[PDB]
């Protein structure tokens, strides 16, 4: 169907959206449901909670992915610690492009939560991030960003050659060339009228990066003052470097 082998292989590693939104969703009910009122059920904090869950999901996806599954645990940890927030942001973005609308945010659980709302129960420093993310959503919606392209970017974000002290550097650099070539082949063959979808798609990664940077600083700032419950995974990841 004019779809390069590599990409079809990358699509088989994708999780099944519904079963993921269900699991996570459940986990949250199983949460509140317990401490019915005494604790902290504020807005923002609920986000961190799902972000932490969206994270286990990313780890799961990577763990079962075609080339990543051949790396030793040390390298897998290095690659994941280097892009965990980018994968989150990318994920959130592709979800809005594929299942979002006007001014409504489609959460990982499957719940739409009017953009308007979210912006009224959160601080501006958070509001600004979300909005930075929503700008990309608009661009990517105009570029006809599809799932096949979405999986290619996940691998381009995960298999970064700019990570140092990797045991098997050649493999990471191999995957990287394997995917770029695939994404190029695909976008020109499937969207030939769009002169530079390829170039345009790649321009998004440094933007996704710069956003995950502000994201992490905000999170870190909110954590240094009990404004974040606890997410052994969110916080752990957050303390891989920290400066």
């Amino acid at each position: 169907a004019s779809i390069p082998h590599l990409i079809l292989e990358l699509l088989k590693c994708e999780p099944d959206e519904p079963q993921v939104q269900a699991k996570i969703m459940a986990y949250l009910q199983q949460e509140q449901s317990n401490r019915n009122r005494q604790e902290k059920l504020s807005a923002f904090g609920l986000l961190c909670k799902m972000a932490d869950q969206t994270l286990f999901s990313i780890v799961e996806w990577a763990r079962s992915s075609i080339f990543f599954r051949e790396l030793k645990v040390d390298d897998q940890m290095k690659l994941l610690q280097n892009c965990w927030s980018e994968l989150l942001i990318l994920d959130h973005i592709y979800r809005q492009v594929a299942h979002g609308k006007e001014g409504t945010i489609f959460l990982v659980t499957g719940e739409h939560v009017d953009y308007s709302t979210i912006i009224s129960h959160t601080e501006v420093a958070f509001n600004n991030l979300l909005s930075l993310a929503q700008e990309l959503v608009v661009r990517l919606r105009s570029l006809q960003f599809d799932q096949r392209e979405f999986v290619c970017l996940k691998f381009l974000v995960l298999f970064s050659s700019d990570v140092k002290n990797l045991e098997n550097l050649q493999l990471v650099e191999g995957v990287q060339e394997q995917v770029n070539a695939a994404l190029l082949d695909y976008t020109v063959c499937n969207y030939p009228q769009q002169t530079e979808k390829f170039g345009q798609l790649l321009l998004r990664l440094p933007e996704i990066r710069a956003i995950s940077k502000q994201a992490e600083d905000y999170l870190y700032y909110k954590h240094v003052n009990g404004d974040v419950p606890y997410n052994n995974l969110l916080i752990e990841m957050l303390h891989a470097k920290r400066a």
């Binding site: 763990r63 752990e236 891989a240």
Partner: peptide, 11 residues
Amino acid sequence: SHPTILYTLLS
């Protein structure tokens, strides 16, 4: 460092 939770998840 020796990423604890991530390790439990990756091994």
